[PDB]
Amino acid sequence: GFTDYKVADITLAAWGRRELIIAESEMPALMGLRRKYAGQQPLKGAKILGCIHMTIQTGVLIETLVALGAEVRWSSCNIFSTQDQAAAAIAAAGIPVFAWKGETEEEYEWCIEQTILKDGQPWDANMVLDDGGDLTEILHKKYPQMLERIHGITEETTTGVHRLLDMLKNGTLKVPAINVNDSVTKSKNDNKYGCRHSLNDAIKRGTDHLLSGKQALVIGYGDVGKGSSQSLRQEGMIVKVAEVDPICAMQACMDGFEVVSPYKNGINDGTEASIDAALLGKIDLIVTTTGNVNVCDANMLKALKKRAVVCNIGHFDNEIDTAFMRKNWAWEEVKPQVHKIHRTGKDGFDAHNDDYLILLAEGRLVNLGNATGHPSRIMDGSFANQVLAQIHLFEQKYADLPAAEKAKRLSVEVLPKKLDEEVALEMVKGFGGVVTQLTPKQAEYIGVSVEGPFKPDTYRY
Amino acid sequence: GFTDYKVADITLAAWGRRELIIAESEMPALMGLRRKYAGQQPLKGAKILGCIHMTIQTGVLIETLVALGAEVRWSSCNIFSTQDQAAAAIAAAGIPVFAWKGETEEEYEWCIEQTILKDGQPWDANMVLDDGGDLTEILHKKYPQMLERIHGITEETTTGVHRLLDMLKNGTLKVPAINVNDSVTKSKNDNKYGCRHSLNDAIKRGTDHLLSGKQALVIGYGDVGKGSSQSLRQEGMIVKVAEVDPICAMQACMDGFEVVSPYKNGINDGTEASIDAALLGKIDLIVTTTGNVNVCDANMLKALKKRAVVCNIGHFDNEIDTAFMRKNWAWEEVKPQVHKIHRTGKDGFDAHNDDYLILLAEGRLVNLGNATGHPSRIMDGSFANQVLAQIHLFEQKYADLPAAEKAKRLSVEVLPKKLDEEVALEMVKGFGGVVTQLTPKQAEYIGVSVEGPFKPDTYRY
Amino acid sequence: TPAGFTDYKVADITLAAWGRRELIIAESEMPALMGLRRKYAGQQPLKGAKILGCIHMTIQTGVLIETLVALGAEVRWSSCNIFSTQDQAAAAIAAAGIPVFAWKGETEEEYEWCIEQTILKDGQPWDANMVLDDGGDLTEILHKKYPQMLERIHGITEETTTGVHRLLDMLKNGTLKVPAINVNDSVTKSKNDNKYGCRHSLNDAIKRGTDHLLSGKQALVIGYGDVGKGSSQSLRQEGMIVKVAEVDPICAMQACMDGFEVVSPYKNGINDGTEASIDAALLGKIDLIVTTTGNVNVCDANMLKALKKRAVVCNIGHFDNEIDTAFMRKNWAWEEVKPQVHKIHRTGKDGFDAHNDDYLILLAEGRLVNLGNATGHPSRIMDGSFANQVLAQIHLFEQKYADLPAAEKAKRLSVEVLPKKLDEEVALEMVKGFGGVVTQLTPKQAEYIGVSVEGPFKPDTYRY
Amino acid sequence: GFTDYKVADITLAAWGRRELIIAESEMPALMGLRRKYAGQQPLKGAKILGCIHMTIQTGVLIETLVALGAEVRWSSCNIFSTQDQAAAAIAAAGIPVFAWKGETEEEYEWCIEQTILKDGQPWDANMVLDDGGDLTEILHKKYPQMLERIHGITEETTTGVHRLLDMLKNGTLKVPAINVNDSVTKSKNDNKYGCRHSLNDAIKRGTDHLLSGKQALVIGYGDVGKGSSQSLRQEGMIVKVAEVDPICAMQACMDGFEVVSPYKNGINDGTEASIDAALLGKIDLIVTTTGNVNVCDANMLKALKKRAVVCNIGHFDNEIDTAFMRKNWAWEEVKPQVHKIHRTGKDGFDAHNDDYLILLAEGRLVNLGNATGHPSRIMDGSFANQVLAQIHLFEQKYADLPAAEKAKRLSVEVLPKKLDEEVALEMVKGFGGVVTQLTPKQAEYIGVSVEGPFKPDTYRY
Ligand SMILES: NC(=O)c1ccc[n+]([C@@H]2O[C@H](COP(=O)([O-])OP(=O)(O)OC[C@H]3O[C@@H](n4cnc5c(N)ncnc54)[C@H](O)[C@@H]3O)[C@@H](O)[C@H]2O)c1
Ligand SMILES: NC(=O)c1ccc[n+]([C@@H]2O[C@H](COP(=O)([O-])OP(=O)(O)OC[C@H]3O[C@@H](n4cnc5c(N)ncnc54)[C@H](O)[C@@H]3O)[C@@H](O)[C@H]2O)c1
Ligand SMILES: NC(=O)c1ccc[n+]([C@@H]2O[C@H](COP(=O)([O-])OP(=O)(O)OC[C@H]3O[C@@H](n4cnc5c(N)ncnc54)[C@H](O)[C@@H]3O)[C@@H](O)[C@H]2O)c1
Ligand SMILES: NC(=O)c1ccc[n+]([C@@H]2O[C@H](COP(=O)([O-])OP(=O)(O)OC[C@H]3O[C@@H](n4cnc5c(N)ncnc54)[C@H](O)[C@@H]3O)[C@@H](O)[C@H]2O)c1
Ligand SMILES: Nc1ncnc2[nH]cnc12
Ligand SMILES: Nc1ncnc2[nH]cnc12
Ligand SMILES: [K+]
Ligand SMILES: [K+]
Ligand SMILES: [K+]
Ligand SMILES: [K+]
16 A cells, blocks of 8 residues: 655556666676675665656666665656656655656655655655755755754765865755765766767757757866767767866867857857857857856857757756746747747747757756666666765764764765775676786786775876 | 087987977977066076986977076987987087987986986986986985985876885985876876877887777776777777776776786786687787786787787886797897797797787887877977976975975975966967856856866866 | 548547647758759649658658648658657648558558558559659559559659669569669768668667667677668767678778678678577677668577677668567567567567566567667758659659650660769758858869869769 | 899898788788789789889789789889888899889989880880879870780779770770779778878878867868878867868768868859958868869968968879969978978078978878878788789780770770679788678578679679
8 A cells, every 4th residue: 555655657667667677787786786785784774865866777776775774765856857667666666756757846846855754744864865965955954953863965966066065165064975976987987978878869869860960069078078079079060169177178179179168268258249159150059068057148049050959968957048048039849858949039939930949858957858868887887886875874873973073074075996996897897898907016016906996096097 | 519418410400400390389388388487587596307208399398498597417218219300409409418219228327327427427406307217216226415406306207106106105205206297287188198199100100000900909098098099999990908997997898998808807827828818819919008017928929919019108118028028039120119029939030930929119118119209289288297397396495495394395296286277278279279267156156266276186087 | 630631540640730840840951852842842843743652651751741742742651661650740741631551560460551551542543653662562562462553653763772672673574564763872862871870870779779878888780781881880989899790891891991890690601500600609799789781681590599698689771581580489588678679588488587687689679770769860861862752753753654655665664863963962952951061163173173063073983 | 133223222122021021911812812823824924014102012012913924114103102112122123113202203204214115115015004194194195106015004093094084085095994993992992091091190200290189171072082081080180171072072071070161152263352261270281182183272372370281192293282382482391291381482481480381292192202101901902903903904915906806895994893802802801800601592682692793883882
């Protein structure tokens, strides 16, 4: 008589289960942690509030936490990123999950609140796993008594870590966190290669546009922008890159891209005259990758070539000024998560108007909104780190420490390099790769143990 | 009446000068420092012992130091890396330089010592610029009193930083140092993209072999291994990668390479039975990139496919067991720095034997030995960092400090990120790239100053 | 849908509005085809034409259908594959009052029924006088079962390599009854569609069907003609380690020089029918096999037994007999993951453990995977192919073969390609769609290389 | 006492021989022909006049013809393409060769005449092997009596075939010819992949410029233009492509290139106003690939970005208007085949002037002029076809036929596809590739013999 969930359609559960079983064979690091720790039950007693895209890959993460002893209550961290068959399979396994593709904003907040509350009162949570910081924020602002009993947060993504570091800096962070994003097997695997796989995937599912021979502009060249730029260049696009960071821009140049600014001389003074109209008028596709605000702004959108595609693969939709478009232009739904925005005016449009832009996922994360986000074998790395991070903070038991000891432990840390390497090793074996073992002489020669770690903590890969 | 030099052919000086004038137009960061600091003369009083490949690019570096006030005495840090027209142009400008392509080991040592000694007595040096640590070693072992006058060392490359760190840990480093290698505009510019440009260059010059369609094995996948693998893959080689570091091996898999070991299951027995003979029997080209010892060992060389090319682009020739090949196999010079190594025995070869390997540059740095090393526009980043590091240590005046201040400053440091970004910006402008300026609101949104630095010190790019 | 219109059969007519929105987008991606619509509309060159059409009922085909109708033609349409229809495209066409019989996921019986519904109107042969085909099935049915109808048909315009082969066989046997245009061998078809279309759509279909990471995995592409070239690139550009098999040494040479290792599934290349002939070590490392040949049983039963566990198997050539799926149906249990995705469990026939690890993933039951698991080629590519189709239909319809006396019929009974000038004109509209600018020769330059300033720019022997 | 030759330095012969021995192992199709036909001596009595770039690869071709029974007299078909060690090795073998790197035009004509005349009288020639048609033209215009006794011409390259067809059309062609260029194992191997290998090779040897991140403009996208554009794109250049043929331009678009014209709207009306100065002012490198005349004209040269590199990889130097540059601008030799062209005037130049272009090889084919042209394993295909073509025309004995029979055979033909395939099979085997054999049922299914040919003559590959 299990009813403690809310999903689009429970009858999709068998299909979700078939895909979970396939995904297990694509996730050797995650499944190796199941096998290694299931006897020991290191998460026995853990009660995890989880807020992360409810995909098939997140289903394997959830069932790994459960197989190691945890109970969980789960929601998605984006209104479009759930795969409904995945949510259905998790609900059908007796796991509380509140998630469906195509939530409204009010439904989004309600789903998170249903994980926090059970039977109308605070659940006895003692761990948090978050992607972007929304659940973390709600707990600090609205449920501080609950954080008193929480041992830690394990945060997935660059934007979430930034929000954690602001709270730490301000003295408002109440529990320690592990920055899962900055493991190498996360940031330089998921953020880069995952977007390489899934950006052109989403754009093809959304539009079925030929990409070869067309012009793209990628805003940002951090890990996501590097992977995005490659997603498009490998399809034959002519890709230009914008950056505020000259080091990242130097990389874009050396990687064979032309580095351009939307603004003359790079000076974003807020005027229409600032816009490089000749450049924007030739762009067929713009992608935002920054985690920053209003990097595809109203004046750029006015100057874009007719029928250009606009999308965002950073965490939040305010990279693009969609608010301006809602206020001024008429939206025509092509199909779910694909809209034509008619720049002819706000009240109605001609069905044969040629002066429109195509917006994907209403500006939300496009790889998850129009496709299925990153593939299982990439998320394997991210999610093995999540499990290791959950084990570490749960075993530390911050909430039970005296106040003076808490003060020594209140920080945002990454996992040790040695664990990062062990995750990577299982990923390499998943491809059939064979890592060589140093001889004792060779290990002495470079100053490392034969077992690693093989690099100093400052190494950038 | 200038005679304080030793080069191959002083009449090459006009040709060297024409190439230096071209190189200046390719090195906007270096030339920007020349313009910015010429008036201040920040290196007036500096007496720099320099040991680094006497290329055209190093000539621009040397003449930037001199233009900022320095005196120098120069040698090359490798017996095959000098460009003789560069050495001549520098000597013809009245600068002491002792360097030619094709030195013997004894001549190499004599050259360093001609920089250290002036008129048979130790020069009154007070600064050191080094690439690989040979000059640094000699000063510490053979001229330790000269280090009483020296304010610091600025070290170019990964292997030399390793050696500095060992002395630091042993208490044997006598003067502070700047690790120039680990600026991002050095390690992730020079070490990776320089080798991408110059590895296939050197193999083409040495052999004129078609690379497309042939099998390569790159040993190592750090920065040099990454750029080398791309040098070969972009020519159409089928590239396999070996690694001892699982994180680097994970990157190779995601970059689209098969990861293999020369040894069965990765276990280096020392026995012939441990060699994967089927794999090595198909390899047309092996390239070592590790900075480690004997990573292309005698049993691997015996197993390689007939007529395979063997080369090393790490800093020292002991990556490849060339001593085994000298002792046991007969060497045929094709032309300078290209030898066929006949596996038929030691006592003479047949001109038409088919069982030989081709060794480039006798196993020394192949891009410098068989071509011209990295191009000017890439060395621009490395050498701008060198100049900044020289100004910083010279101004700190370590040797003039009380012993109390000395212990506090005796360290191996990197340049601050702000300077790294300023170097990157000049490189970007040299491609005609335009970096965007953050608005106040955007800078506040991501927590940075509009002028940078744009990333925390932990960021990996 | 016009009042009283029931002459169609599609999955769901309520998908029509969606299809129409996608048709309007596709028009903006198809400048060559829409340039013909604009150039020839007032002339109505297909007035009186009655075209039986058999080709994948996609959005791209919808723009083709509506261009023919806009030029005067009547049509009756079916798909040439049981999984290639886009149901919203079919609904939009049915809702414009155009007879179409097509949906995604037909049985073989339904497939044949659909073609027959184009041929028969109200239980009697329609008065067709033109044929547009993709693969030769409609052509074969007409020749075998309705020969009298070919008496009124002025020609066939055939889309694809496999269908051209079948026409040339009939021509060689004296059994082709009407002239045909080989649309496939326009350069703006073969070297555009067959190659770049599969580049776009092969990795697309594999992602949609499996969501597998492809970077760092091992692929084997069987064949390296135009489809094999595009397919290999689709996978290599994703980071796959791609090996190529070929029987043609010249195509194999191109694969070597393009940076691929060239291998055979069989020891020394010799396929003697024994298990001992299979290179088991090679096949046991392959994560993905793609067949591209137009040939039979190039991924045979002994290969399927030796493939690495959990490898993906698919076919992007025209017919499903590239892979021995009959063997898998006879011997192994099929698990449907979702439509057009099956796990084939090699442990036995009449059951499988839900957690079995010894299965293969077969996409689209061995049928054209780009069309079965994604949407086939993109509009801007099909633009080339379908502008040639329109030109070819105009040319045979104006030639009026069925009206000529016996004397001029023997003269005109041929299989021909479009002239190069027309190929260039299609290409020029494609280039302009990318915003490309073609340079004009000066008179002295045109004289120097011996062409007119207006072209054609190459001899007919030129290979591009 | 062999003196019937003229080369730069006969003492280079030993080095040239070493490189020939390496090249033989890189040329399996050609050495397969040696082994297959040596006992038959199918060219016994052939006396071949040869005019083609005197490289190591041509040396293997010459000695294959000689091995099959031919005598030859040889010259190069370009003033800068000879490798002097290859010329020396051939002369030292007793083979008449007249060729060196850096001929004047008068020397170039004298060298061809030295092949035509032996001891001041027409040699008893009976075969012609040509590259570009210069020897063919001289024989028709000045030595018609020799052509009465010549059985045929085997012509290497697009431009020479064009010249032959013009003669055939005008009725001035005196002997039949085989178009070697249009074997697939020539045109779609040599013309494309050869230039892919050797264009960036020459540019690096000439300038040592970084290419990644810079802007290139390739004029033409036939086989040479396709391979040249890949040569640059694979180095990270941003490549734009110009074309007059819309089908080739469509291919460039689909291959991921932006297709532009030097002229506004592509109309070359001869006025400076017609030049797209904005576009050309951004180009760092222009490469001509057309076989046409003046496709990099005076107004384009005036408009190119300062310090742009200019080169031609088509057969003749009139693709670039170098005449204009000699008449108006001052030339500064950097090193052989590398010139700065100072656009400040004809009247000398300032050594530090910034307004120059770098011209490679004085506008002659840059891959052979500034490097070594195509690699052995690629030229293997072209030269196995040359050998088969010589055998075919020599055995047909056209000169010995009655006039009515000559009239039936006077044509320009290609080799049969079966031989094209047999050449390709040897090439594939040299890479270790394994071609599959059709079963009888499969061969029946697709309508071919198990032995091939596998494609109809109309197939384009
Ligand atoms: N969709 C996905 O699957 C996915 C995956 C990982 C991360 N993310 C999100 O993507 C965003 C980027 O993450 P990251 O790891 O690449 O961060 P990052 O810090 O490595 O890169 C962001 C880059 O944007 C640049 N940038 C900032 N403002 C800019 C502006 N105005 N114009 C141009 N460039 C600008 C910065 O210089 C930086 O290099 C974050 O929101 C992160 O959470 C999404
Ligand atoms: N030739 C050049 O122009 C040039 C340029 C820069 C640096 N270098 C030299 O190249 C070397 C590498 O420098 P780097 O910056 O890439 O260092 P790095 O530490 O980034 O990379 C070296 C890599 O080798 C791997 N490795 C070590 N031992 C191995 C073994 N037995 N088998 C396989 N892989 C193994 C390590 O795991 C590491 O990833 C150093 O000697 C450095 O000084 C040469
Ligand atoms: N799915 C699509 O969108 C699409 C697009 C165009 C064409 N097609 C179809 O794809 C198929 C191939 O078309 P194409 O234009 O590339 O033809 P093609 O003749 O250019 O190429 C087929 C290749 O297969 C090779 N081959 C034959 N038997 C083989 C074997 N046993 N092993 C290995 N290689 C073998 C041939 O040597 C040839 O090079 C045809 O059925 C055509 O109708 C499909
Ligand atoms: N350097 C080498 O090693 C080498 C190798 C092979 C051939 N070649 C020579 O290279 C040249 C080209 O040979 P190919 O086989 O590529 O010929 P091709 O006919 O395949 O290509 C030449 C191209 O130039 C284009 N073109 C003509 N005039 C033009 C103009 N004004 N602007 C732009 N594009 C224009 C044509 O449309 C055509 O596509 C010939 O001279 C040939 O002999 C040189
Ligand atoms: N061209 C170059 N000059 C100096 N040091 C180098 N290290 C690598 N390439 C170099
Ligand atoms: N999208 C498509 N529509 C019709 N026929 C096709 N053949 C390949 N892709 C196609
Ligand atoms: K996914
Ligand atoms: K250099
Ligand atoms: K499509
Ligand atoms: K060569």
